[PDB]
Structure formats: C-alpha cells, structure tokens
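Section 4.2 – Deliverable D4.2 (structural model, holo form)

The reporting period included a commitment to supply a predicted holo structure for the target in complex with uridine-5'-diphosphate. Inputs used:
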Amino acid sequence: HMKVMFIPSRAVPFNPDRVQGGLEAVHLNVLKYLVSIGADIDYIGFDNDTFGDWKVTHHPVGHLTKFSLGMSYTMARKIVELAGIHEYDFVVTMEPTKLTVQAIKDAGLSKVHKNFMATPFEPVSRGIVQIWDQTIQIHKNGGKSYAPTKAFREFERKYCHMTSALTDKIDYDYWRANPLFEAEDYPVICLNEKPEVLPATDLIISAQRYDTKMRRTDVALEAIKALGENGVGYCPSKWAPPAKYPVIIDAPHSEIMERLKTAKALINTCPDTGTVENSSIEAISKGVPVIQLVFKDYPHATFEYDPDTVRVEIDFSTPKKEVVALYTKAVLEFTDTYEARVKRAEAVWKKYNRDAVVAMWDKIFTA
Amino acid sequence: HMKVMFIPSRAVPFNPDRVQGGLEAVHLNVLKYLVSIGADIDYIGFDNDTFGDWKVTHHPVGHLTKFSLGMSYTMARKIVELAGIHEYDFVVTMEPTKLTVQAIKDAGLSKVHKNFMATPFEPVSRGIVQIWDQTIQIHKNGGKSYAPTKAFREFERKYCHMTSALTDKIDYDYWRANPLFEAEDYPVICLNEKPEVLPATDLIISAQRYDTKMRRTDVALEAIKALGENGVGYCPSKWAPPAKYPVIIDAPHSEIMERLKTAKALINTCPDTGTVENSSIEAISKGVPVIQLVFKDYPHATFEYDPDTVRVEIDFSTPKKEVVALYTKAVLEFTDTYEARVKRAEAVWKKYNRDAVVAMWDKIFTA
Ligand SMILES: O=c1ccn([C@@H]2O[C@H](COP(=O)(O)OP(=O)(O)O)[C@@H](O)[C@H]2O)c(=O)[nH]1
Ligand SMILES: O=c1ccn([C@@H]2O[C@H](COP(=O)(O)OP(=O)(O)O)[C@@H](O)[C@H]2O)c(=O)[nH]1
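Output (structure tokens):
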C-alpha cells in the first residue's frame, strides 16, 4: 500500500543475512519493516545486492566495491526520474550524500524525506563532517532525521559545540539552534513474543569487534582471559584480535544469540561512543546484564536499555593499566539474581513489543 | 458472485501447501471450497499470507509471527469498515477472539456468521477457555458453529460440565441448556477416487505421535514390540519415542499410507480425546480396521468412521501395567475378514467421496 523510494547505505552491498552494527543495522531494520507491511519499494541500490524472497523493485547504479562519483550521479539522476513517474509517500535514506539530498529536493520529495543515522560526529574525519553537514541540510530542506536512542539525541546536543580545522563550512549557528533529530522513539529491536528468561550459567561473553580505539576490546579480552573457562569472546574476521587473545571468529549470529540466553553477563567496553550498542540490547532483551565501561557524565545506550546497569566508570586520562585492572575486577566479582534478569527483560519487552514497535514506525512514517 | 468475509486462524500465516492437522486444516478446506465455487472473498489476513493462483481480495492487518492485540483491533476495525461498504452472504471464522465476535455483531453480520472449530475444551488452559467462551457468545448472537465429527458434538455435551479456576466467567447455565454446534459435520476428509481394498498381511501399524498423556503411545509401542516382525511404529521427530521403542522417524506421509493399504490393523491408543482421529479414517478408508483403546461411555471418532470397531475398554483408574497387558492381548488375538475390510471402506467412501464432500459444504453454506 505504501509507495516508498529507498536510498541505502553505501559501504557494502545489501545482504539480509548480514549481522553487524553501525548504519547497516539501521538499514536492515527499516527495510525489513517496510517489506513486512508489503510496501511497494523502489530501491536505488547496487548490482551486487541480494534480497532473497523480499519484494523489491531494484534500480541498480553499478557494482559496489567502493562507492564512486559516477554511481552517485547515476543514483541522483534516478531519484529525479522515478519521482517524475511515481507518487511516493516517503523517501528513505541512510546518511546520504550532498547530491542525494539535493536530488530529493529537486524531485519534490524533501517534505516526505525520512533519514536514519548511526555514525557519531567526529570533527577530525572529513567524511563524517560531510555526513552531518547534510543532516543539517536535510533539516533546512524540511526533511526529518531519526536517532535509534535518546543517548544519540543527547550526544547530538554535544556535537553542535565540537569543532576542528575541517568544520569551517558547517553552519554552527543553525545547528546550535535546531536539534537535528525528531523527538520520536525508533524501534531498535522488535519482540514478537514475551521473552522466556533462562537462568544464568557462569559464562560471560564479549560480542565486539576488536577495535582498541573505539571499543577498547583489548580491555574486554583481558577480562575474558582472567575468566578462564567462564569467559568467551566473539569477533568478526574483519575485526579480528591478535593471537594473544583467543576468540571465536565469524560465528553464526544465531549461535551467539542462542549462547547468550544462558550467559551470566555481557562485556561491553565502549565508553565514549555508546550511541546504539546493539549487543547490549541483544543481551538485555534476553535478561542478560551488561558490565559497561563508560566515561563519567557521558550518555550511553546501555543505561537506556537497562537503567540499573553496572557502571565501570573512567575518563579519558585513566591509564590503560588501571582501566584493565578496574574492569577485570568488576567482571570477576560480578553477581546477579534471576529476578534482575526477569526485570530487565520485562522493561525492554514493555518498550519494544511488536505493537509498540508498529506504533513507533507509524509516528515516523507520518506526513 | 457469492460474497464472503473470511477471518482466518491466527497461529501461522496462510500457506496452501501446509499439510498439518488442527484448525489450519479446517481453515484451508473451507477456503479451498469457497475458491472452488468462485466466491468473492474479502480475506482479513496477514501480510505474509500467500495464496498461489487463488482469487482473494486481501486485507492485511500486519506481519504475523505472534498474533497481537494491535493486530486484533486492526482486524476488528477492518470487519466494521468492509461491512459498511459490502453486503456479505456469509462471514467465515476460525475459533475467533472476543473482539472479532463482537465486531461481527456490531457490523450486523451475526446472523450470517459461520464458525468452524477443532480445539477440544480444556479447562486448565486460559486460551482454550476463551475460545469456547466465544463459541457460547456466537450462539447467543445467533451465529452458527460447526464440528468435524458427531464425536466432537457428543464431547461438547461433556464439556458443559467441566470446570476449573479459569472458568468462572463461562455462562454454564446457558451452555448446559444449548448445544453449541449445528447438526452438519464439516468434511474432515475427501476421497477423490474409490479405494480398492487389498487383502491384509499380518502387519499392524501405529501412526501416532509419542505422547503418553494424550495418546498413550507407550501402550501402543509395547504392543508393537510384542508383535515382533508383524509390528511397526511411525513417529514424527517432533514427538519421538525413547530408544526402548524402535520406530521409523519422519517417514514421508505417502509411504505410511501406501504401507497401510495392506496392514491387518491400525493401533490407536488415544482413549479420552478421540475427537477427529485422522489416522483412524486414514486406515478405515483403505479398509483397515482400528484396534481402539477407549474409556467406557466416552465418545470416539473411530466408532463413527466404523461402528463395528473393536473396543479395548478401560477407565482413568486402570493402571498402565494392566492397560498394556489388556491392549497387547487384543492386538495379538486380532482377527478380521476381507469382507469386513470392503464393508468399512465402502461406508467411508459413501460418506466422504468428493461429490459427497461438496454436498456437505453446500449444506453448511446455505442461507
Ligand atoms: O563476532 C561477532 C561479534 C559481534 N557480532 C554482532 O555485531 C553487532 C555489533 O554491533 P554493536 O552495535 O554492538 O557495535 P559496533 O560494531 O557497531 O561498534 C552485534 O549485533 C553483535 O552481536 C557478530 O555478529 N559477531
Ligand atoms: O510418523 C507419523 C505419525 C503420524 N502421522 C500423521 O499424523 C496424524 C496423527 O493422527 P491424528 O492427527 O488423528 O492425531 P493427533 O496427532 O491429532 O492426536 C495422522 O494424519 C498420521 O497419519 C505422520 O504423518 N507421521
């Protein structure tokens, strides 16, 4: 019934069986929903996309390895073409280029533009500055952007005061006076049936990319080593750790989730950029607590999913030597009741049950 | 030309190639009939339904994984909407919710309401109590409900007097004074070609789920062991027996049926809840007799399919040790003539031949 134009993320071709974090998770979740309600989707994507049995009218702009200029102009041209022959209820985007945003405007779709975000603002990165520059442009044009969490919305009010040598073009006057995200909640997960919380083993799991700068996974896997038999780490091969930390590489996501059901806790060591944190909600939805490394006075999505989360508190000056010891101490000394597992699973059930999720989507997809 | 509103079962999305029992079988068979007579069908279903080539005007209420409250209110809203624009000859229902039944009444369709049932009354189950509560409500509102067998209608006169802590809301006064089902069966089976009754081997077959509580399959497989070479058991993997009872797991249904053609008898050990009993009619339609374990003074579908069925008679207090011995004795001592095979096959052929099945449906779908 809904007619929708869909402009995807541009890092990798779409695959429904991919499970990772970042923008790809948002991309998948929005698309999956639209397919579930039988939307007529004009998907301006890449020749190497796959959709399985999903009904999608595909408009390829080229084979994707690295997104190119030619591809972008093909995409922009296609936007305008399609908008001429079809009446779209909405156009969906995933952190689009300047050219896409301009094309949406010229096509007359700016006021039905629904944009979704995941990448934190990082002034040092030319590419990310462009992303947020266009988030500002979308707001000026009268489109709407949506954040997965309240944490991300709080971070956005910090982002407007962050500058660098690369941010001279950014309209900070406009940004500071206009919160770029809409107030409405976004369904980061969808629970169709009320979860059956299983009792804990002693096993604690880290389901994180090996990334010392962003996620401080070295700290995580140092705690894993200290746990011995009661500790396991999962890493993708694309973000594998050094040999000194044995982990399970590229495990089927389903098997990780199945194992997580009976875990005592989840290790999460991303302190400063906890904007979405999918592995946290993956755990808490099953009743599993997160042992969260975090900066003092920083927002974090984990505390949103479970207010009672255990905090291992640091700041940017805390030496690695201390951080490891302090975090390892929290992990080895971790206790948690079965009732607390039921409680935290219930809170997430109350928020992200199917009926609540559809209501959330409805508010997003309103003209 | 005939205009019908169709409210489906709610456990799984509709698939025409699904070949399970229960309410889904009734759902499929009623829909298939309506399609066969070229009915104009407004189907208030789920986005993930599929219909193949069948002509159906689909009115989705959401993607179905677990039926939700939101879906139910969407469905109820759609009922009222459609009834405002269209004059329906019938509205078809599959064990509906309170909300659906109320919606049908408010829409002014209660007197053309045709409801179909399959689930036996179980006072301990909150969900099933709701189902039968609404069966009562349909009768009060002036709709009509239909049972698979005469046995099911006899069971309904026992259901009147069954209570629990969950049945305080049930209007037992009304129920006891009003048999809920109409006199016509809905056709549980359809025989397209007359079976040619083949002479018996000595082989006796149990085609039952391993379920000691409901079907007392342990008793069955104890008789199988006593038969030795002249005994075989079939079980699905979802209801497999212990190692002590060797059986054939997840055999193609067609192979079981093919084998059954030359069997001396069929073992059926469900004494209490013989409401439909598909394996009984599967056997008797091929001329194969059933050796039926049954409670004294209890109805049973087997005796409906073949009045002359041999009864192994027990009650609830009979110890398992005795029941096994008594049933094993009946199995080993079983004799049966070829003429009796022809006779029982003929009776079932007369009742459930394709043309008779159409006639059965026709009587149900009369104003
Ligand atoms: O070996 C692994 C480790 C993680 N994950 C999944 O990858 C996602 C990681 O996303 P998250 O938001 O937790 O972190 P990010 O990678 O975006 O920093 C989660 O769904 C994890 O369960 C996975 O599939 N395999
Ligand atoms: O290994 C097996 C055992 C049984 N059945 C079929 O499953 C049904 C079981 O009988 P029925 O539905 O009467 O019993 P219920 O399972 O409902 O108690 C019949 O159609 C059997 O032929 C089957 O396909 N495979």
